Amino acid sequence: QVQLQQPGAELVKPGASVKLSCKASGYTFTNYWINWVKQRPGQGLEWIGNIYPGSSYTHYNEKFKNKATLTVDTSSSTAYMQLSSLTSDDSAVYYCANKLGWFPYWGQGTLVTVSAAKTTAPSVYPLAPVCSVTLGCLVKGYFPEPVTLTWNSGSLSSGVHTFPAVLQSDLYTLSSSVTVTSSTWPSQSITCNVAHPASSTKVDKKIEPRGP
Amino acid sequence: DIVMTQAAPSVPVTPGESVSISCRSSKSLLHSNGNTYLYWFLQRPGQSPQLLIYRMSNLASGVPDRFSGSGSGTAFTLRISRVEAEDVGVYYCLQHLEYPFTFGAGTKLELKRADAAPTVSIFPPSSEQLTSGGASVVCFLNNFYPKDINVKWKIDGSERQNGVLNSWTDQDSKDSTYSMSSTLTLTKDEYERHNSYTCEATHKTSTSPIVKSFNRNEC
Numbered sequence: 001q002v003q004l005q006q007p008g009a010e011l012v013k014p015g016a017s018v019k020l021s022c023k024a025s026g027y028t029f030t031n032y033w034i035n036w037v038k039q040r041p042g043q044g045l046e047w048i049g050n051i052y053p054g055s056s057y058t059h060y061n062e063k064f065k066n067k068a069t070l071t072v073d074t075s076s077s078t079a080y081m082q083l084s085s086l087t088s089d090d091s092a093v094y095y096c097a098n099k100l101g102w103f104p105y106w107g108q109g110t111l112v113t114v115s116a117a118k119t120t121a122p123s124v125y126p127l128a129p130v131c132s133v134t135l136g137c138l139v140k141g142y143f144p145e146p147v148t149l150t151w152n153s154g155s156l157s158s159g160v161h162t163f164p165a166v167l168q169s170d171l172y173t174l175s176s177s178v179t180v181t182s183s184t185w186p187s188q189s190i191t192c193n194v195a196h197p198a199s200s201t202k203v204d205k206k207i208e209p210r211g212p
Numbered sequence: 213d214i215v216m217t218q219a220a221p222s223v224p225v226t227p228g229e230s231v232s233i234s235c236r237s238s239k240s241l242l243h244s245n246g247n248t249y250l251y252w253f254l255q256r257p258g259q260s261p262q263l264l265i266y267r268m269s270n271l272a273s274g275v276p277d278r279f280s281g282s283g284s285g286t287a288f289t290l291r292i293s294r295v296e297a298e299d300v301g302v303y304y305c306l307q308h309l310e311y312p313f314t315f316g317a318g319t320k321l322e323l324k325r326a327d328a329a330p331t332v333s334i335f336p337p338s339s340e341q342l343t344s345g346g347a348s349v350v351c352f353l354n355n356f357y358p359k360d361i362n363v364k365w366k367i368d369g370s371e372r373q374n375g376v377l378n379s380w381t382d383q384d385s386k387d388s389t390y391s392m393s394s395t396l397t398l399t400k401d402e403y404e405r406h407n408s409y410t411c412e413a414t415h416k417t418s419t420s421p422i423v424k425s426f427n428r429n430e431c
Contacts, residue, residue: 035313044304044315044317044318045255045261045304045318047312047314047315059311059312061312062312095260102267102270103266103272104251104263107260109260123344125338125340125341125348126340127350128335129333129335130335130336130430131430131431132331134331134352134354136335136350136352138341138350138395140341140348161352163379163391164379166378166379168377175350175395177333179331179354210431212431
């Protein structure tokens with residue numbers, strides 16, 4: 001299976017540069033074009049440029065000629081995009097994608113946040129009901145975006161609502177609910193899992209019934 | 213550059229009915245090789261774009277036969293014969309005939325389903341948070357329609373407005389409803405000075421308030 005692996009996040013100081021990676025597997029990397037695409041939060045898709053890894057032949061959108069540089073490493077089958085002198089207009093998700101004949105495949109995207117604020121890992125709190133059943137998970141005080149929240153390591157996916165984060169004081173907070181049959185819990189195990197890529201942290205919190 | 217125009221930012225549709233989404237190019241996308249160089253994609257929240265149609269009219273593997281693509285050399289249409297909940301998201305056209313490649317600006321589908329009452333759940337602060345000196349109370353109002361909804365917090369019967377932050381989901385991919393989370397953040401000392409906590413909502417599905425409460429010491 002064709003796959004393109006991108007890191008979830010890069011925190012970048014204003015005026016600094018960043019180099020984004022895109023690791024390819026499942027096909028011959030040198031033989032197909034790699035494209036890069038920008039998406040600002042809540043906005044549309046914009047094409048940056050492409051590169052043919054066997055030769056390093058490139059095309060750039062004129063709009064990005066002084067912002068982006070595309071290269072490859074044919075030993076590690078990795079594509080790279082360097083972005084220079086970042087401003088707040090550069091905060092966005094950046095996707096890599098390839099083209100195998102008519103058929104494109106996409107990476108998951110890297111969220112670049114341009115800010116002088118420091119990385120902060122979240123505090124994660126399990127929320128049991130008041131003394132179907134609904135459980136919650138509160139993810140408080142992190143920076144930058146994103147996190148990845150799952151229930152039971154992704155095996156519990158139905159009846160889940162994970163909400164958009166809210167920003168206050170250079171820190172984000174997010175919540176999630178999950179709704180199961182009352183015979184399911186607390187007889188069986190339900191755990192919230194939270195990964196924060198910018199701090200390389202992963203935390204698990206089992207939901208336990210409240211005591212006296 | 214070739215300009216790609218999707219003139220509608222959003223299109224409403226009743227579940228079960230057909231919808232057509234338009235895209236126009238500033239010049240013909242017909243190649244000398246006989247193929248028309250036009251893609252359609254669907255993007256869901258937080259996800260990479262999913263291929264729907266390639267070469268203007270070919271249905272991609274795994275995409276239901278409810279989807280089709282047609283067009284001239286400059287006016288293109290994505291048609292869904294019967295819209296289902298899973299079809300919600302933002303639709304994009306893309307030309308790849310000439311560099312630079314260019315996308316249209318996106319069209320969101322809005323599914324106008326039947327009214328649905330919210331399911332409300334309230335959560336006292338986690339004991340683990342209290343050790344840190346803070347106390348967040350959370351209220352979920354889940355699977356309701358339409359999107360408009362009010363929440364009010366009351367402490368010992370008096371309205372509390374400060375310290376409340378709210379967030380809403382996009383339309384659910386299975387039932388087309390909305391959900392909302394409301395968080396009231398207090399210091400531990402403030403939380404411990406009161407006993408009754410109430411999340412009170414209003415929504416068009418009821419002529420009276422929808423309420424969930426707890427007493428801090430009732431365990």
